[PDB]
Design a protein around this ligand. Sequence first.
Ligand SMILES: CC(=O)N[C@H]1[C@@H](O)[C@H](O)[C@@H](CO)O[C@@H]1O
Ligand SMILES: CC(=O)N[C@H]1[C@@H](O)[C@H](O)[C@@H](CO)O[C@@H]1O
Ligand SMILES: [Zn+2]
Ligand SMILES: [Zn+2]
Lengths: 269, 269
Amino acid sequence: MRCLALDIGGTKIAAAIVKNGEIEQRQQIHTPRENVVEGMHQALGKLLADYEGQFDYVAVASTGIINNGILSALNPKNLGGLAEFPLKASIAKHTDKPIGLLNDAQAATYAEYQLQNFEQVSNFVFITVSTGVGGGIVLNQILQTGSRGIAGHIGHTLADPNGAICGCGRRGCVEAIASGRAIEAVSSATALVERSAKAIANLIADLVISLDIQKIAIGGSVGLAEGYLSLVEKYLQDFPSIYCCEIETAKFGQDAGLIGAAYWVKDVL
Amino acid sequence: MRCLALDIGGTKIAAAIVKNGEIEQRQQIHTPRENVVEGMHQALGKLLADYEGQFDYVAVASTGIINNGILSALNPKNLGGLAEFPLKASIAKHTDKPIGLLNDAQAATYAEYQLQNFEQVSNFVFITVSTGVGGGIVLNQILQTGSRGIAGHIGHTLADPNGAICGCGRRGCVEAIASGRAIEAVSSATALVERSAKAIANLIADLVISLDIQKIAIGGSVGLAEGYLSLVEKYLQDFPSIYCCEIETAKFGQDAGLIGAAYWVKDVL
Ligand SMILES: CC(=O)N[C@H]1[C@@H](O)[C@H](O)[C@@H](CO)O[C@@H]1O
Ligand SMILES: CC(=O)N[C@H]1[C@@H](O)[C@H](O)[C@@H](CO)O[C@@H]1O
Ligand SMILES: [Zn+2]
Ligand SMILES: [Zn+2]
């Protein structure tokens, strides 16, 4: 049908009309860095004005833990210090069409999985390495969300018990070491990108041995970066082969959240 | 019905008759430390002689990755250097009754989960801290095994990228830092047990944020050790509360593999 898709990230908000699977009227605005609550409300109202009368429903792919129309920030530092935002309510102010909501990496995992050889890939993870580090887990071709929408927050699993404190409050999260935010927090060389890639290869090994994942797609601004995937591949062959699996770049690229949310909201009516 | 249960571990083999859910004729013999292939065959044949004519089926809970009647050792050092053993075949030499096979921690996870408030606990993990470190994952009240029987090998996820090399070939596995084998590999103080408990609290945090686990049961010789659980609990409250969940000791104790395998083999006919 006709979908209004939002992809709220810590750095960018995207928006588009997914119609019969195709992205039409793409926009991309900065995510507010200050006055964030006021800013999120103005941005959502603007974006909903722009697409007035062209959608049957609203699908939202949002960074953070999404449960009961509420965005809870595991890492408030991705959302400009914001802890929580009444995401569905704020959107319902502007339309009475249905509104469905999903974590941003869960939505992207749904998108990329649709492109899988469904019978020979039943356990699949998509990893975003962008502003933060996010993930989604499909197991027996079912997307995990959890009772609370937490499933997939693989960026806040342990990369190093002696590493930086993460913005979530935990020490040594993968996101605290590998993410875009973590990379440019130190640069203010090549060796920086390697530390990020090695941490992501450890996370891949972890998900393989823990969940018997058969395939992993990598996305996000850092993940899709020319040369990154090959660096993660190089670190994966230090492991015993049992930890290896095939890694490919996300094929929807930066649109995977839009299409995933659009198709996910539809496909669980 | 009438079940012959085997619980093959890196240090002990147990055996018993599970009948109508109760353990009867328990035995426990050392797991061979040398001449291991010959030893595993003699032990299985002995144990099968002892219980001749008293079982309808054989349920095997085995350390290692269990796929197609074959035990593959992720950490051969737990099985006295053994890499692989034709586990189901060796047992089929002595009976024509059916033989079902499961990882040892997957079986125990099945046991302990049966004691859960099924509606309010749908995502559950059981962690063994014994000879090695093992685990099983229940998600939407379904035990994960994987296409290859790997799901649950949480002992070989990352605890420290600068820690000991694990016997699996990977550096810094949880098992390489927290396990019984890892503890007594250094002692040859209190601070040792703490390092083990802290690593296990990081693993608990990991499984909670990654899979939205609602409850975790701890088992095994180290896990059930007087004072260990409280030490893991103490390390869990250093984390933001989102990573916390309720931890209780395994209630079947050292019989969870026997009953789990017995009931699992039956319950997926
Ligand atoms: C606001 C927030 O805490 N986002 C999480 C996680 O939900 C996101 O998926 C990830 C990437 O978007 O960044 C962060 O790790
Ligand atoms: C032989 C072997 O590699 N066993 C694994 C794992 O399968 C077991 O569950 C764990 C505890 O039994 O030890 C080891 O980590
Ligand atoms: Zn974190
Ligand atoms: Zn290991």
